[PDB]
Amino acid sequence: GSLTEDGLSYKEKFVVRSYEVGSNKTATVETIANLLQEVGCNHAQSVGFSATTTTMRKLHLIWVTARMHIEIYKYPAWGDVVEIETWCQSEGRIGTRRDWILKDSVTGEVTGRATSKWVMMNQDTRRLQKVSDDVRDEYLVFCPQEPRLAFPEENNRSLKKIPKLEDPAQYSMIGLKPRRADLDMNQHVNNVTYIGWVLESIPQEIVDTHELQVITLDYRRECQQDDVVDSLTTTTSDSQFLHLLRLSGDGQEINRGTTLWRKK
Amino acid sequence: GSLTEDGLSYKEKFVVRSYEVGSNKTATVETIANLLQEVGCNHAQSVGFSATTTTMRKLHLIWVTARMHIEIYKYPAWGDVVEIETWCQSEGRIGTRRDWILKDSVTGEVTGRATSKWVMMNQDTRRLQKVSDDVRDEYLVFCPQEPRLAFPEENNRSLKKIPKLEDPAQYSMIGLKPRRADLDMNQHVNNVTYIGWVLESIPQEIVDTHELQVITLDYRRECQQDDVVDSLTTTTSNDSQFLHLLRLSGDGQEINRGTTLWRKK
Numbered sequence: 001g002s003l004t005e006d007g008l009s010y011k012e013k014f015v016v017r018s019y020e021v022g023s024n025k026t027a028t029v030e031t032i033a034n035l036l037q038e039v040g041c042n043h044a045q046s047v048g049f050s051a052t053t054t055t056m057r058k059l060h061l062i063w064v065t066a067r068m069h070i071e072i073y074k075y076p077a078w079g080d081v082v083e084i085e086t087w088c089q090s091e092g093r094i095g096t097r098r099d100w101i102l103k104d105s106v107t108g109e110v111t112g113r114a115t116s117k118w119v120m121m122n123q124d125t126r127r128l129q130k131v132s133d134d135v136r137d138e139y140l141v142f143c144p145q146e147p148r149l150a151f152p153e154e155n156n157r158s159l160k161k162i163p164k165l166e167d168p169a170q171y172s173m174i175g176l177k178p179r180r181a182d183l184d185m186n187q188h189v190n191n192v193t194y195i196g197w198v199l200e201s202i203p204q205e206i207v208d209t210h211e212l213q214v215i216t217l218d219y220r221r222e223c224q225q226d227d228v229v230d231s232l233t234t235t236t237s238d239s240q241f242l243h244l245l246r247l248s249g250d251g252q253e254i255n256r257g258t259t260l261w262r263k264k
Numbered sequence: 265g266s267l268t269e270d271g272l273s274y275k276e277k278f279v280v281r282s283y284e285v286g287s288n289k290t291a292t293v294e295t296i297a298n299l300l301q302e303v304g305c306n307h308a309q310s311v312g313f314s315a316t317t318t319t320m321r322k323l324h325l326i327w328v329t330a331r332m333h334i335e336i337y338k339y340p341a342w343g344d345v346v347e348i349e350t351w352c353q354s355e356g357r358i359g360t361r362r363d364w365i366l367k368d369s370v371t372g373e374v375t376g377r378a379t380s381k382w383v384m385m386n387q388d389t390r391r392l393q394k395v396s397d398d399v400r401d402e403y404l405v406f407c408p409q410e411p412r413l414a415f416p417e418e419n420n421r422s423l424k425k426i427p428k429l430e431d432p433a434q435y436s437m438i439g440l441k442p443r444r445a446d447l448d449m450n451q452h453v454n455n456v457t458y459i460g461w462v463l464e465s466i467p468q469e470i471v472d473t474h475e476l477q478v479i480t481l482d483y484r485r486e487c488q489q490d491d492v493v494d495s496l497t498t499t500t501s502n503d504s505q506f507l508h509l510l511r512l513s514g515d516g517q518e519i520n521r522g523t524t525l526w527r528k529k
């Protein structure tokens with residue numbers, strides 16, 4: 001991978017691996033979510049980060065995902081080359097936004113796109129807060145000044161309010177515990193695991209007869225290593241579903257989202 | 265990736281990804297096991313396989329893993345290039361053997377090596393069978409004629425008999441169900457998931473103060489999508505040895521058994 005000519009975005013090609021595809025011989029949405037996360041990490045290293053800034057490290061402040069939205073038009077097949085272009089952008093005092101464009105390496109056409117909202121939060125306390133001093137100026141030099149959105153369209157699927165799933169849920173997958181492979185380098189549950197857990201309540205018949213077109217996921221709380229999750233789903237409709245991830249015990253909401261599926 | 269000059273082995277380089285490393289910023293043993301499986305799939309595709317042969321597809325026979333042995337000297341760090349060289353070899357009427365050599369792309373030294381035993385199974389009835397004469401002459405052209413072992417040694421740990429864990433187990437991880445990410449393109453539980461499940465019963469303190477040096481894993485039965493596994497472990501030993509056992513939570517049907525060796529950091 002490498003930064004573009006202007007240095008305001010990063011590009012990287014990937015070859016789809018055999019263990020990364022589903023029954024239809026095309027990359028799974030979790031594989032795509034992993035590749036976006038990988039290209040975002042490389043963009044952060046290529047600009048001098050480790051993701052954190054100078055003032056963000058002297059003060060115990062980290063970046064945490066608040067929302068992830070992924071729209072796929074074509075899933076790359078096992079063996080295909082896919083180029084993802086990512087970039088950061090300021091969103092005022094709210095936080096940072098990171099967008100991605102998935103392209104086919106042979107045809108050059110956009111096969112998918114994604115957007116994500118990020119918030120501040122103290123590492124040692126887990127608050128929210130916001131700052132504009134050194135922090136805003138530190139990443140402003142690595143972001144395009146004029147608006148560059150992956151989903152520009154006024155009133156689009158990436159900015160909609162997600163409602164809370166009412167009980168009882170139509171479908172459910174209970175007793176979901178994360179394992180060492182689900183944790184990251186800091187021993188925190190990877191954000192991609194929540195995507196796989198949300199899709200665990202989707203019926204197998206829906207998966208075998210439909211393709212996941214859109215997936216919006218709001219992040220409310222972090223599932224810990226010793227926690228157990230309950231995935232809940234209800235059909236609201238193409239097929240639309242409302243999702244809810246909560247701790248098996250108290251019923252503490254950790255995630256909520258929506259999925260759209262097209263007939264094959 | 266690409267086949268070597270003689271065409272009797274395949275080489276492929278990989279860049280270690282951020283999501284593929286553990287707490288020590290080095291690739292996990294499951295990531296390594298995935299890269300060996302990926303380089304093995306590309307070697308099969310490059311020689312004209314898909315990894316069944318012409319007679320194997322006609323007779324409804326497939327290749328199944330019976331044993332996996334992995335010995336790691338150095339785990340590649342996040343961002344490092346690692347080149348794995350794999351090759352097939354006939355093992356008489358028992359089956360095939362596939363070996364791997366992990367090397368560092370910058371220093372060129374061997375950072376790990378692995379071996380695996382494969383058997384022929386009827387796709388439909390899941391009945392194991394000895395390799396017939398017609399099948400052996402189809403893949404012999406893609407295997408080196410003279411013995412080429414990754415673990416040649418007189419008494420290596422890749423050919424040792426693994427005993428069954430006695431009850432009660434010292435450590436255990438109960439209620440392990442596979443998810444859609446654990447299944448492969450044929451909806452079968454990936455062989456790498458069993459490695460991650462075996463290590464689920466290993467204490468967190470052992471992981472945080474030791475590095476996995478050797479892992480031998482015998483495959484007895486396959487875990488299905490709707491099955492639940494119980495991982496069991498017992499210490500048998502500076503180095504620490506453990507005996508493992510994977511069994512279905514219900515009936516207690518053994519699906520896997522193995523051993524792990526760990527050295528102090």
Ligand SMILES: Cc1cc(C)nc(N)n1
Nearest residue numbers: 065066119219220221222
């Ligand atoms: C916005 C947000 C996201 C996450 C994962 N946790 C918290 N507390 N807040």
Ligand SMILES: Cc1cc(C)nc(N)n1
Nearest residue numbers: 328329330483484485486
């Ligand atoms: C040797 C072997 C391996 C597996 C996964 N299943 C069976 N039946 N036999």
